[PDB]
């Protein structure tokens, strides 16, 4: 439904709730074939520009085929071993003798066809381009004579159009050592992508999800080059499978919480750690530290579980009570009081300290609040921009309801002198033990 926010003054953090999530849990591989032409073009007396243009485009086809052949001859490097194993196993199955003959027989009459491999997977094979039919029917009888016959310019243009997709696919597979991502329209047309989504063994809500956010689906897919053998170019497209759809998700924004003394040597700082996207998954929480593992579209979010962390759900209680030992809520500490701002989903957190000019001007009315020293938050209702020093941030104007959850900033509960400020990343219980160790350090002396 409606996305809402809750800013926690106690922890200098904001949580954006209400997002409907789609987490990637599986891969669906599919074989995409291009029927190529094995030809031995032979020398004719040619001079006129049409014969040269045909032979030029024909040479770009021959060099593209030999370049793609040496690409499978020497492509041992792997870009991401943890995410292309499922497709690499299919290319290794295809490298067996007679398996390519199998897919060549099943896709003899239709563009799409299911093939049962010998290792059991039922993969979907698709012939998206047929250059062998065009070369064997329209080009070889014109340029395989004793002297070349003069072809009309319509054939030259239609052949540059058909050969272009081959040259661009060979370009992408060559510069990236056979593994390209995202999957471009050269790799897979929008018509082929929607038909492949429609033909997947997934729910209709999942086909509608991938179909209205096809660009996000493309950014989370891989294209792996298999083999060129017997006038066939085959490559596997690895598409994301969202086994969890419409799941509740939360977004944490964090900012430094310092004391407001006039002496940089008497101030201590603290910032909540593990900021990012949190999503519900089977009774637990999946945390995504990397920023590119979650693409967001409107209310919807599309995340990838390959590089994520599974934590108990009590970690969300760190947003309302961080000093609670029931969950070891981790923080980072320092003695560096530098100003910053974080634009949240429905507003903006501002940490202002020292000699710094913090303001929130509006395009239609001037500055309505000049922030004082400390950590604060502002809703997007009526606020357009936030200025911190000589830096200007923009507040997201999406409509929704913010809730200000009052509480005292926790930085006032710490003695500055015995604070561990160099300890960097640290659990709450680690800091509390460091404070019990400093009281043991004071009793004896």
């Amino acid at each position: 439904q409606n996305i809402t926010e809750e800013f926690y003054q106690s922890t200098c953090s904001a949580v954006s709730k209400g997002y409907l999530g789609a987490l990637r849990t599986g891969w669906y591989t599919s074989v995409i074939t291009i029927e190529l032409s094995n030809i031995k073009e032979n020398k004719c007396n040619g001079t006129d520009a049409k014969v040269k243009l045909i032979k030029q485009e024909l040479d770009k086809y021959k060099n593209a085929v030999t370049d793609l052949q040496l690409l499978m001859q020497s492509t041992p490097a792997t870009g991401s071993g943890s995410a292309i194993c499922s497709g690499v196993a299919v290319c290794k199955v295809l490298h067996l003798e007679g398996e390519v003959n199998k897919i060549k027989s099943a896709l003899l009459s239709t563009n799409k066809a299911v093939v049962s491999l010998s290792n059991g997977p039922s993969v979907l094979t698709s012939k998206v381009l047929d250059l062998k039919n065009y070369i064997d029917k329209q080009l070889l009888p014109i340029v395989n004579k004793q002297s070349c016959s003069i072809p009309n310019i319509e054939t030259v243009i239609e052949f540059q159009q058909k050969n272009n997709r081959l040259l661009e696919i060979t370009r992408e597979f060559s510069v990236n050592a056979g593994v390209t991502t995202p999957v471009s329209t050269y790799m897979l047309t929008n018509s082929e992508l929607l038909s492949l989504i429609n033909d997947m063994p997934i729910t209709n809500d999942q086909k509608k999800l991938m179909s209205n956010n096809v660009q996000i689906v493309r950014q989370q897919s891989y294209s792996i080059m298999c083999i060129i053998k017997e006038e066939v170019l085959a490559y596997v497209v690895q598409l994301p499978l969202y086994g969890v759809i419409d799941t509740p998700c939360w977004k944490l924004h964090t900012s430094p919480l310092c004391t407001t003394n006039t002496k940089e040597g008497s101030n201590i700082c603290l910032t909540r750690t593990d900021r990012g996207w949190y999503c519900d998954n089977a009774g637990s929480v999946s945390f995504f530290p990397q920023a590119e593992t979650c693409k967001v579209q409107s209310n919807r979010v599309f995340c990838d579980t390959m590089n994520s962390l599974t934590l108990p759900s009590e970690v969300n209680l760190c947003n309302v009570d961080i000093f609670n030992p029931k969950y070891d809520c981790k923080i980072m500490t320092s003695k560096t009081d530098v100003s910053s701002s974080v634009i949240t989903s429905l507003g903006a957190i501002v940490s202002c300290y020292g000699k710094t000019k913090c303001t929130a001007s509006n395009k239609n009315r001037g500055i309505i609040k000049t922030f004082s020293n400390g950590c604060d938050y502002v809703s997007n209702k009526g606020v357009d921009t936030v200025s911190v020093g000589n830096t200007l941030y923009c507040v997201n104007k999406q409509e929704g309801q913010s809730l200000y959850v009052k509480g005292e900033p926790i930085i006032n509960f710490y003695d500055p002198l015995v604070f561990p400020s160099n300890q960097f990343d640290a659990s709450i219980s680690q800091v509390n033990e460091k404070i019990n160790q400093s009281l043991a350090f004071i009793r004896k002396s």
Partner: single-chain antibody, 236 residues
Framework: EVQLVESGGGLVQPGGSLRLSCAASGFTFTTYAMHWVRQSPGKGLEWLASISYDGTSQYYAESVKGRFTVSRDNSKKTLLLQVNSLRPEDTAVYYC???????????????????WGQGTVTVSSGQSALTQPASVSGSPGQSITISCTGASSDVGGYDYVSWYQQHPGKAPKLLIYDVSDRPSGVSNRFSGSKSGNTASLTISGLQTEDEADYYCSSYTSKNTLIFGGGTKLTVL
């Protein structure tokens, strides 16, 4: 022992459908391309169809397009030709033939035929775009030459002309491929040439085994195959 054997035929009704097939033994199928060629009694040869090593491409002659379809099961090692809408003018001996080029699919890369079969009869009771001579008398120990005349699209434009020796009531054997090259088992005396629109096969030191009928074929620029009339050599 590269052996092809034809099957299906006998007597049949003018109308309905009819299936003909072939069998492969002595060679590797996935490397050979196939041909169907027929011959009315006491008449010349006529091309029909051809399929590539993978059965993907399949290109026919115009006179028979539609009523005929050629298929192949590489797993079971056979070649099939289905006949629909049989006509009284279709009664002929149907031959199975092969061509040695593999991994290629354009009809120009396997336009010659070197392996043949016995032939099966298809009879129903109630044709040469190339041109050769018929009468060619030759006394032994002399040299006579046969004229296969085409017109630019065939023979002329393409240095793609083949020559075959067929003995009365037997399979055709290959003599010349490309324009002058010959396969094994072929006597030196067999030798062929080309000059513009006309190719010519020459034979010197005539023997008795050589009294026979002889044919020519070429790629056609129309993606088909054209067969000549057939010349009767008489030894004296």
């Amino acid at each position: 022992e590269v052996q092809l054997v034809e099957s299906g035929g006998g007597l049949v009704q003018p109308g309905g459908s009819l299936r003909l097939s072939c069998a492969a033994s002595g060679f590797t199928f996935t490397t050979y391309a196939m041909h169907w060629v027929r011959q009315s009694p006491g008449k010349g040869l006529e091309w029909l169809a051809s399929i590539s090593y993978d059965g993907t491409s399949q290109y026919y002659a115009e006179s028979v397009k539609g009523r005929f379809t050629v298929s192949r099961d590489n797993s079971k090692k056979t070649l099939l030709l289905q006949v629909n809408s049989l006509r009284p003018e279709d009664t002929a001996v149907y031959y199975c033939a092969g061509s040695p080029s593999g991994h290629y699919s354009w009809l120009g890369y396997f336009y010659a035929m070197d392996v043949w079969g016995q032939g099966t009869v298809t009879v129903s009771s109630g044709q040469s775009a190339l041109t050769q001579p018929a009468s060619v008398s030759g006394s032994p120990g002399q040299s006579i030459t046969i004229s296969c005349t085409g017109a630019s699209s065939d023979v002329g434009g393409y240095d793609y002309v083949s020559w075959y020796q067929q003995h009365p009531g037997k399979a055709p054997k290959l003599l010349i491929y490309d324009v002058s090259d010959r396969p094994s088992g072929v006597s030196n005396r067999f030798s062929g040439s080309k000059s513009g629109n006309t190719a010519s096969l020459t034979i010197s030191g005539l023997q008795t085994e050589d009294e026979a009928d002889y044919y020519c074929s070429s790629y056609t620029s129309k993606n088909t195959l054209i067969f000549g009339g057939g010349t009767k050599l008489t030894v004296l």
